[PDB]
Structures are given as structure tokens and as C-alpha cells.
Amino acid sequence: NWFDITNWLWYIKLFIMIVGKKKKK
């Protein structure tokens, strides 16, 4: 069931936030 999707939806979203720091542009 697609109930607690945010449980992983945040984890996968937290990754980008990291790489997003790589370099400056």
C-alpha cells in the first residue's frame, strides 16, 4: 500500500540535496 511513501520519498530527495553542493554553478 502507498501509505507511508514519504518514508523513502525523503531519503531519495535528501541525496540530491547533497550532490547539489558539489561545485558552484
Side-chain angles (χ1 to χ4, degrees):
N1 42 92
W2 296 91
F3 251 118
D4 324 324
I5 188 182
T6 178
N7 299 12
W8 66 262
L9 208 84
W10 178 88
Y11 284 135
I12 52 132
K13 258 184 253 192
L14 101 87
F15 171 45
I16 300 104
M17 276 202 315
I18 302 169
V19 286
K21 285 140 63 129
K22 309 241 296 248
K23 231 80 269 200
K24 224 187 77 191
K25 199 89 98 144

